[PDB]
Scaffold this active site. Sequence first.
Site, PDB file in Angstrom:
ATOM      1  N   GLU A  68       0.830  -1.196   0.000  1.00  0.00           N
ATOM      2  CA  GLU A  68       0.000   0.000   0.000  1.00  0.00           C
ATOM      3  C   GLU A  68       0.869   1.252   0.000  1.00  0.00           C
ATOM      4  O   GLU A  68       1.989   1.261   0.518  1.00  0.00           O
ATOM      5  CB  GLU A  68      -0.927   0.003   1.217  1.00  0.00           C
ATOM      6  CG  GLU A  68      -2.019   1.062   1.181  1.00  0.00           C
ATOM      7  CD  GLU A  68      -2.982   0.866   0.028  1.00  0.00           C
ATOM      8  OE1 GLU A  68      -3.894   0.021   0.156  1.00  0.00           O
ATOM      9  OE2 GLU A  68      -2.827   1.555  -1.005  1.00  0.00           O
ATOM     10  N   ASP A  96      -2.132  -5.289   1.201  1.00  0.00           N
ATOM     11  CA  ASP A  96      -1.489  -4.128   1.804  1.00  0.00           C
ATOM     12  C   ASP A  96      -0.031  -4.393   2.161  1.00  0.00           C
ATOM     13  O   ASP A  96       0.830  -3.547   1.902  1.00  0.00           O
ATOM     14  CB  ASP A  96      -2.258  -3.688   3.053  1.00  0.00           C
ATOM     15  CG  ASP A  96      -3.624  -3.119   2.726  1.00  0.00           C
ATOM     16  OD1 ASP A  96      -3.747  -2.418   1.702  1.00  0.00           O
ATOM     17  OD2 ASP A  96      -4.576  -3.380   3.492  1.00  0.00           O
ATOM     18  N   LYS A 122     -14.630  -8.666   3.885  1.00  0.00           N
ATOM     19  CA  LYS A 122     -13.331  -8.782   3.231  1.00  0.00           C
ATOM     20  C   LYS A 122     -12.970 -10.232   2.933  1.00  0.00           C
ATOM     21  O   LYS A 122     -12.233 -10.500   1.977  1.00  0.00           O
ATOM     22  CB  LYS A 122     -12.253  -8.132   4.097  1.00  0.00           C
ATOM     23  CG  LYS A 122     -11.197  -7.378   3.305  1.00  0.00           C
ATOM     24  CD  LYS A 122     -10.625  -6.218   4.106  1.00  0.00           C
ATOM     25  CE  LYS A 122     -10.142  -5.104   3.188  1.00  0.00           C
ATOM     26  NZ  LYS A 122     -11.231  -4.191   2.746  1.00  0.00           N
TER      27      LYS A 122
HETATM   28 MN   LIG Z   1      -6.512  -2.639   3.157  1.00  0.00          MN
HETATM   29 MN   LIG Z   2      -4.861  -1.757   0.053  1.00  0.00          MN
END
Ligand SMILES: [Mn+2]
Ligand SMILES: [Mn+2]
Lengths: 183, 183, 183, 183, 183, 183, 183, 183
Positions: A68, A96, A122
């Site tokens: 990320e 991430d 998620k």
């Molecule tokens: Mn995330």
């Molecule tokens: Mn992300």
Amino acid sequence: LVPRGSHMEDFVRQCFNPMIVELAEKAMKEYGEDPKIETNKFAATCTHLEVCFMYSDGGSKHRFEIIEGRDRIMAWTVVNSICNTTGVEKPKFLPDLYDYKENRFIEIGVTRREVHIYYLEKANKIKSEKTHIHIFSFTGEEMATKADYTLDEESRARIKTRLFTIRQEMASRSLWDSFRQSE
Amino acid sequence: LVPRGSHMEDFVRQCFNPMIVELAEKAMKEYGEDPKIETNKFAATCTHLEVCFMYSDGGSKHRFEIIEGRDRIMAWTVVNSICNTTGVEKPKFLPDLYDYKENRFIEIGVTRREVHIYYLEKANKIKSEKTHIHIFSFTGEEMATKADYTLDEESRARIKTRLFTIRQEMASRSLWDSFRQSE
Amino acid sequence: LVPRGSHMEDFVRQCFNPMIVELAEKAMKEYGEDPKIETNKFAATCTHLEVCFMYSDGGSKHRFEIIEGRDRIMAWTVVNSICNTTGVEKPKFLPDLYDYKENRFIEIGVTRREVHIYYLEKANKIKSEKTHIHIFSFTGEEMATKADYTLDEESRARIKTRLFTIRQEMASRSLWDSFRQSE
Amino acid sequence: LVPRGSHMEDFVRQCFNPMIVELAEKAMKEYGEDPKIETNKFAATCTHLEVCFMYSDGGSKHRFEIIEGRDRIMAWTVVNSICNTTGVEKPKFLPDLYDYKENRFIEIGVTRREVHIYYLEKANKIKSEKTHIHIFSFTGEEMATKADYTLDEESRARIKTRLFTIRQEMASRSLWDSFRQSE
Amino acid sequence: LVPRGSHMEDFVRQCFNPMIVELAEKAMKEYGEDPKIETNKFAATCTHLEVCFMYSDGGSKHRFEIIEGRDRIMAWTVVNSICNTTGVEKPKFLPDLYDYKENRFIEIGVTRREVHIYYLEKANKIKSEKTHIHIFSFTGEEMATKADYTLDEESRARIKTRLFTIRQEMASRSLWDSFRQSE
Amino acid sequence: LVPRGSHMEDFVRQCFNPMIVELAEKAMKEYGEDPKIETNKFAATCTHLEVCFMYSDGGSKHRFEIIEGRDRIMAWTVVNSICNTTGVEKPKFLPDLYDYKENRFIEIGVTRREVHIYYLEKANKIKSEKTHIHIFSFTGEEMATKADYTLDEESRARIKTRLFTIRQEMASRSLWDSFRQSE
Amino acid sequence: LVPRGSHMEDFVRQCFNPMIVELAEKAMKEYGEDPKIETNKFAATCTHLEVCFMYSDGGSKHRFEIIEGRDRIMAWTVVNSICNTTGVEKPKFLPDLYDYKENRFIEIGVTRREVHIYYLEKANKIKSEKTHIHIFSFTGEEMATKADYTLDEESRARIKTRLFTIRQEMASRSLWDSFRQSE
Amino acid sequence: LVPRGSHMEDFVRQCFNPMIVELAEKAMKEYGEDPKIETNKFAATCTHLEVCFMYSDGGSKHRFEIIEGRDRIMAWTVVNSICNTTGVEKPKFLPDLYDYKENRFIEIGVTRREVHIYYLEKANKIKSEKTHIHIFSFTGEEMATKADYTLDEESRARIKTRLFTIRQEMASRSLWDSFRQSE
Ligand SMILES: [Mn+2]
Ligand SMILES: [Mn+2]
Ligand SMILES: [Mn+2]
Ligand SMILES: [Mn+2]
Ligand SMILES: [Mn+2]
Ligand SMILES: [Mn+2]
Ligand SMILES: [Mn+2]
Ligand SMILES: [Mn+2]
Ligand SMILES: [Mn+2]
Ligand SMILES: [Mn+2]
Ligand SMILES: [Mn+2]
Ligand SMILES: [Mn+2]
Ligand SMILES: [Mn+2]
Ligand SMILES: [Mn+2]
Ligand SMILES: [Mn+2]
Ligand SMILES: [Mn+2]
């Protein structure tokens, strides 16, 4: 359409360090979003950005690879390099972090509802198996796959404190109720 | 003879940090090579330079003495000092690192062919016995003497990721096939 | 669609200082353009950016107000402030500079064709009367309204030299013919 | 009322680093005190400030959350966040530190009398149970709740040395007898 | 062949600022010269380098374009740009400066013999007519074409002082007699 | 009496970092010695200074208190503070370090003769019992009280390498024979 | 009483540079005012602060002595020094600037009503004769004693632009109507 | 003999910038004086140092060569270079400045008695004719040879203000009467 300033935008600029907001801007703009209009999404991206950086800070020196906060094409390049050297299955969505110590990708989420609900949300999306999930909330709860929290208590504890501080400062300016409603 | 710029030279300047390219330049120029002409060797020296610096970064605080990246006469001065204080046999060729923890010199190589082939190549040259060899490739394989990899997995893992990233960026600009052919 | 790198993109990153490319990126992205795809327009925005900054550098300490290189909504805010304090007519299009010494807005253009043609092109668009126009080319010619060149010869001379240098470096990598064709 | 300078004020400015004195000023001024008049209290706040920063320095990377040295309203915000995520009882008075490793607030005091007396003084005030107390003196004695000194000997030892150095420098300028009398 | 250090090399490193010696090194190495062996030529290149930078410092803000201290291929690029925008005749040899105010190239020389002799030497070489020549000596004399000294007295005066200081420091270490003999 | 420069002085300035030479100067000048005349003692103080700083670098974060490199009156202030908080016997001569981990003062010496001889020399002087002694030589030998070397091998090993490097660089300029004769 | 944040406070922190807000804070706190409560007065002090710094920027190198932005006791010290060396009459109220070129004190005011009204207000207060007055408004008007505007047009022009920009940004967040009502 | 601190020493450290006090220390120590004992002479050297630096600041870019604030042997080297290039008579005593614009050495003095008396004192010493003298006092008077004040009024005016400020701050701590008595 796009104005000169909003109360959320000015709070975001006085709440997160300039490196975080600079990166949320380039990130949002990379996906056709204006931080001057999408003010709540702007606060979310900065919150999500700061969480990921404190997370990688908790580990050892060379423990994590930060996915990320990169250009979307650069991020896939590092993912490709990680998969092609460790042999890990290539994820369907951009994660991430990558954890060199546990050899798994990490997806980090920040929620203003129950960590129970976001995690299930998620989890139904990824379907990459080897991708770890770690969910934080603005109330101080966390939720990890296999209850494997990767980091120790103290590193996770300060992240929860930061999130609750952000929740207070947003409420002191009467901006929290709109923020919680956005998610 | 020497031009104003090449596609490789501009990629090298946007790929490695300015300290690395500054040192590869002084190094190549020390040996009668122009980075503006020997563009592939320029990319090799920067790759080999960055690997050596991540390697010494993996160890403890005072673990390594960096031999590579010095003036050739300064490098032999440190080698002389290391031999004359530890009693280690003086190598015939300039090594890259010295390991204070294991009391041995390290030679680090980066290859675009099989790590099996380069290691045998580098091993037939040294003949210093006490000099360790650690070979990396652009595909993610490594190869060390006695299978003693000196550093842990995670420090070695990130080096492999960096190498594969460099391989991708070189290919995205159609410069990899010429690079692999140079070695 | 968007790749990992292009020969133009890498030349642009090694040709202009990091502040210029950072601002061309935020500028292009503000208008739905990707510097990783629109590589020629990327070089144009950086060239146009550097020209405007050398231009304002030629004047006195407080001579110019820089309009270019700002967020599009911030740029109109400064234009509004300048009009509402000096009484100057508000331009229809965003200018590049404001000249406090001559009390007029300046539009700066950089062309790879005849300065005669671009000036006529830019003049038919503005129709703001009080907006000055100053055109530069990559061959060393310039063209200003009323032949009022605002700055002295030496400040304008170095701008022409910079432009011809950029033209050479683009040609040494065989990227000029595509660049000139883009305009 | 408030003068241009005092011997204590000039010693304080040459004894503590500029970040410490800047924060003692904003702290004292936050509570209606002028460091230019309350010169002894000025030296106390700087001493108490430096102790708290060396204390948090002794711990691990993410061990402590610094409460002292913040705006009084910001300090309560972090306290609220810590209580609402760890569930720890909210203290009645602002503490100096929070210990993530032991999950307790810390109150740090610096005395120019017996550590026995100050501790009893600070203990009768708190009445928060879960708030740890750690008292230092200018003679080299310390005193902690349950004799749990939180940090190791060496981190606590250097704090005592700093305090005795401050006591000497204050005496070499004949300012100690007035300082000790202030408490 | 090349040693670990010389008395001249160590004086040069303690006499000129690190930016000057870094550039003389890259310059000498660009022309197959080792500053560790050619120690006198090393001192000459640093002296000649510092003179050129004080010279361009004497002028106005945008007065000069610095040719010396660039990569030899970059230097010809700027010369090409200057000729192709001003129309000035292209010199046969690389000059040191370009003067935008007087529209002429400048060649700067530093001599340890009579300025009369070096000027005649440099004049027989150029044969570019429009190239100005400005000669300085280590005794305080100067010599310019048409007696046009380009800069005022005070800027030229400090350059002479710097040169005589260098001559003294070289003599105080018994290194001047060898230096003067080198030219 | 005092000259403009010496070969030793210029080597010392190019061998040790500017912070070390700045402190050796203030130290020598504090004791009526001119580094421009006492050039060998100047090199000794810089060598002794750098050794003490690498030594304290080998320990933990808060392990050592640096006594050397302070103003002579400040150094006794810290010694007084250490004695009056730890209860350690006050030394008769200024030591170099204090070890919080082992609760003893350290005297560090650098010799150009046998470590056996210097240690006996330094031992007959101290007579403080609790003061540790650690002797290094320019040949790679060390010598500590009770053979308690305080630091690990690798931290001590790099110090020996630095010393032998200094010995080589001094010899490459023909300055070692005079240096060894000074002690 | 004092809250965690206000919309004005966050705009002030994102509008003025950190040095300005740091000084307005210490200034307001010096006079028993909290910027977290007196949010409009906070914006006024920052506006008045930035105006004074651009004003002194317009002059020559050593033209002005800045009185505003100092500790109130330091400010009177400089005023005393200026009066006792130039012989100028000592003002009854603290001025903002001293003009060495015209040998007079300057009082600078910023108004959200007619410059005609504020000037008459400030003029009835001073009664120091030799103290110049220069009034600016948020609409672009200015007003000076004897119509002596001290600085040129361009320096005064940019100050007016800055003020109108601040007026727009305050209105874009619906904070201007409250600000104008405060004066 | 030499103590740990004095009221004058601490005021000097909080009054002059760290570069000034660092240079007064090296200067005093160069002449066998301890700033920790000779506290008044310490304040004088810092005052005299700051005056010389503001003086050279008043001139043009390349107007002055600073002699004061150098090592005593370096200062004579620059004096030798100035004399041997300009032909000016070599002074008998070290001056403070050299004026390239007027081709004369300057001696700068700061007095706590009548400028009339110090000037006559300094004039009877020099006897170098071509050496200019410029005397300042702590009351705001100045005195120059031929009444040629070299700099304009405003540059000289701010120097007088600085001196009177220093006089006030010294008096506010009751240190002025001892300072004035020292001269
Ligand atoms: Mn995330
Ligand atoms: Mn992300
Ligand atoms: Mn090698
Ligand atoms: Mn190798
Ligand atoms: Mn534009
Ligand atoms: Mn334009
Ligand atoms: Mn507290
Ligand atoms: Mn406390
Ligand atoms: Mn040349
Ligand atoms: Mn030349
Ligand atoms: Mn010692
Ligand atoms: Mn010692
Ligand atoms: Mn005011
Ligand atoms: Mn005012
Ligand atoms: Mn003098
Ligand atoms: Mn003088």
